[PDB]
Every structure is written in structure tokens, then in C-alpha cells.
Design a protein around this ligand. Structure first.
Ligand SMILES: O=c1ccn([C@H]2C[C@H](O)[C@@H](COP(=O)(O)NP(=O)(O)OP(=O)(O)O)O2)c(=O)[nH]1
Ligand SMILES: [Cl-]
Ligand SMILES: [Cl-]
Ligand SMILES: [Cl-]
Ligand SMILES: [Cl-]
Ligand SMILES: [Mg+2]
Ligand SMILES: [Mg+2]
Ligand code: NA
Ligand code: NA
Length: 326
DNA sequence: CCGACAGCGCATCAGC
DNA sequence: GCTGATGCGC
DNA sequence: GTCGG
């Protein structure tokens, strides 16, 4: 955290462009800049020094100079003092409420947590659950609790069918000491790119996890992706653990590596890797890596037997999960 | 200067 | 009912 | 907002 003040600023700017300005490219520009500076091993002394890094342009260089000199950014000072912007940024912190819905509610006068609770009828299912656990979803999950959750999920899945393989990905797989949520990759031999020999593969797992009262709510659910809420069991006389967000993704077993690569992230790392892939003549998604024909159209899936194989195709030295936190 | 900026699942809606 | 566009999230 | 060509 040598340049914590600077990356925080960029992150706030990014959030402003996404939530308030609805300028997604600026949002990603600020995030990339924050990401490149976050791994820079020196305490930045000036915007010029920063401009040397890829992703940091003139505009950001000037802001970094203003920040280093005064310790703040006038542009952000004003944004903070602006009711509308402040309200919109806040409402987007509720899962299910995005920039559009946030601005829509703010236009209706609904701009505080209190307002949301009294107008619960104006929220869809997801937003309603996000509001319900607003506080809990803000807390981090210690890795020790993640290990507990992992044991529960792997053991409950095993009980449904010994052939299932549940892998915890996301920040957890990257070795994080704390995670925002739990991300679970799921595979079963009956579900491949060639066929789905068994229906409800994801449903059954969800069902079992709900039966043992691990999963408490559902935000969204389909044939291959479950988005919900879970909670560790507490002991007698013991205070209850906070409710946690849990994501489960069922991927074709023969496409596990592209899947675990995707789900392990980070998101910025995935963006960088997928962008680099293109420059090399390939396109990567969570299922496959395909070559790009002279017309730009994606060819057929290339053989893959490990995460490393994907890195080789794009001429990138393999990077352990723990080093993909960009 | 200009176009590119990663890729996709689920929920909701408009138009038919 | 369907398809396609859009919002939101991973 | 930044970048390559
Ligand atoms: O925009 C996105 C979001 C997520 N992802 C992938 C990578 C990410 O690591 C994974 C899980 O998403 P989360 O939002 O759960 N993030 P992560 O687990 O990395 O961190 P956190 O501790 O915040 O959950 O999904 C993308 O590829 N693109
Ligand atoms: Cl933009
Ligand atoms: Cl500031
Ligand atoms: Cl694969
Ligand atoms: Cl594909
Ligand atoms: Mg996660
Ligand atoms: Mg997640
Ligand atoms: Na730069
Ligand atoms: Na939100």
C-alpha cells in the first residue's frame, strides 16, 4: 500500500464515472490506472513518474500531482458535496441496484437506506435481498471462515453425487486472506460440451445446500449459474455469523481449465489476459480459447489440458493464481 | 485523429 | 408464448 | 481516459 492514497482516488473516480456519469470506458480507464499503480514497487513522487506506466495518461498524471501536493482532489471534493451524485453512488452499493436504477430512485426522492426500506415494494427480488443484507454484504469474509464454508460445500456436494467436483475460485483461490464472497466452480461428468445427460445438475446442489440451511436466499438462478446468500452455522449461545454472498457456476467438465481460469480472476487480470489474447490472434472465454481467422471470426476450440496451455497459446509465462490479483 | 476497450448468465421488459 | 435489447452482475 | 498505428 505504498501508493494507497493515489489508488483510492482513482478508484473513487472510477466509481463516479460508472455510477453517476455512466461512462464505462472511463470507469475501466481509472481502474486500469489504479491497478498498474497498485503493483508499482515504488512510492510515486510525481505525475510524470506515474505517466511512465501504461494506462496512466496526461489527465491522470495531472490529478496525481494535485493529489501529491494538496493531499486531495478538487474534482472529488465537489463530487462528495453533491447530493445527487452522493445519493446515486450510495444506492448502487445495494446489490441489484445499478447506475440506472439508482438515478431512477433518486429522481423519485428515494435516496437513503431509510427510503429504500419504506419503499421495498418498488424493488425487484434481487434488490430486495440486497437491501435485506446490506450491512452483512459490506463485511469481508476472513479466510478462516472461507475454509469452513469450503468444507460444508464440498462435503454437501459429495453427498449429492460422488462424481461432482466443487472448486472454490475467485479471490480465495488467489490466496486472499479475506474475500468479498465465495465463488464455486462446479463440474459433473454428465455435463460436457458434447451433451447434458442429466438435468437439474445445478438445482440438486442448490437444493441440498438449502436443506442443510447453508443457502438462505436466492438472487438469481439458472441452469448453469446460481447467485445467492449463505451463512455458516453457529454454536449454542454463540452469536450468528453474517450472511454471505455465494456464486456457483456449473461448467462443462471438458472445459474445466478455461472455466477455472475465468472464475479465478481477478476480473482486471481476465480483462488484460483476454485483451492480450486478441492481440495474439485468439479469443478467450470461460469455455474455450479459439483462433481468430483473417476475417475476425472465431475458429474452433483449441485443445487444452491445463491452465498453462492457455498461457502458452498467447505467449505469456504461466502465472500462479496468487499472482493474478491485478 | 480514431476506434478499440473481455466475454457472458440471468432477470426484466418491449414488441410481436 | 417467442426474440431481442437492456440492466446488472460474475 | 488511454492507447497503438
Ligand atoms: O467483471 C467481472 C467480474 C468477475 N469476473 C471473474 C473473475 C473474478 O475473480 C471472478 C469472481 O467474481 P467476484 O466478483 O466474486 N470477484 P473476486 O472473487 O475476484 O474477488 P472478491 O473477493 O471481491 O469476491 O469472476 C470476471 O471475469 N469479470
Ligand atoms: Cl466512457
Ligand atoms: Cl480527494
Ligand atoms: Cl478447458
Ligand atoms: Cl465457446
Ligand atoms: Mg469473489
Ligand atoms: Mg462472486
Ligand atoms: Na502511461
Ligand atoms: Na449495486
Amino acid at each position: 500500500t505504498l501508493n494507497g492514497g493515489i489508488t483510492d482516488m482513482l478508484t473513487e473516480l472510477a466509481n463516479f464515472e460508472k455510477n453517476v456519469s455512466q461512462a464505462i470506458h472511463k470507469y475501466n480507464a481509472y481502474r486500469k490506472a489504479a491497478s498498474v499503480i497498485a503493483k508499482y514497487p515504488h512510492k510515486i513522487k510525481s505525475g510524470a513518474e506515474a505517466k511512465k506506466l501504461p494506462g496512466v495518461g496526461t489527465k491522470i498524471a495531472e490529478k496525481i500531482d494535485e493529489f501529491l501536493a494538496t493531499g486531495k482532489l478538487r474534482k472529488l471534493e465537489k463530487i462528495r458535496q453533491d447530493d445527487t451524485s452522493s445519493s446515486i453512488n450510495f444506492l448502487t452499493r445495494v446489490s441489484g441496484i445499478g447506475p440506472s436504477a439508482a438515478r431512477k430512485f433518486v429522481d423519485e426522492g428515494i435516496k437513503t437506506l431509510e427510503d429504500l426500506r419504506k419503499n421495498e415494494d418498488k424493488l425487484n427480488h434481487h434488490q430486495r435481498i440486497g437491501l435485506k443484507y446490506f450491512g452483512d454484504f459490506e463485511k469481508r469474509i476472513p479466510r478462516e471462515e472461507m475454509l469452513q464454508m469450503q468444507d460444508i460445500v464440498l462435503n454437501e456436494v459429495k453427498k449429492v453425487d460422488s462424481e461432482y467436483i466443487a472448486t472454490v475460485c475467485g479471490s480465495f483461490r488467489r490466496g486472499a486472506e479475506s474475500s468479498g464472497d465465495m465463488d464455486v466452480l462446479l463440474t459433473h461428468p454428465s455435463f460436457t460440451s458434447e451433451s447434458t445427460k442429466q438435468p437439474k445438475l445445478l438445482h440438486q446442489v442448490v437444493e441440498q445446500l438449502q436443506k442443510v440451511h447453508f443457502i438462505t436466499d436466492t438472487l438469481s438462478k439458472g441452469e448453469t449459474k446460481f447467485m445467492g446468500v449463505c451463512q455458516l452455522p453457529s454454536k449454542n449461545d454463540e452469536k450468528e455469523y453474517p450472511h454471505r454472498r455465494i456464486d456457483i457456476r456449473l461448467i462443462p467438465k471438458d472445459q474445466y481449465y478455461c472455466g477455472v481460469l475465468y472464475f479465478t480472476g481477478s476480473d482486471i487480470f481476465n480483462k488484460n489476459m483476454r485483451a492480450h489474447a486478441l492481440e495474439k490472434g485468439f479469443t478467450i472465454n470461460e469455455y474455450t480459447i479459439r483462433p481468430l481467422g483473417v476475417t475476425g471470426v472465431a475458429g474452433e476450440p483449441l485443445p487444452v489440458d491445463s491452465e498453462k496451455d492457455i498461457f502458452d497459446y498467447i505467449q505469456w509465462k504461466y502465472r500462479e493464481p496468487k499472482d493474478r490479483s491485478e
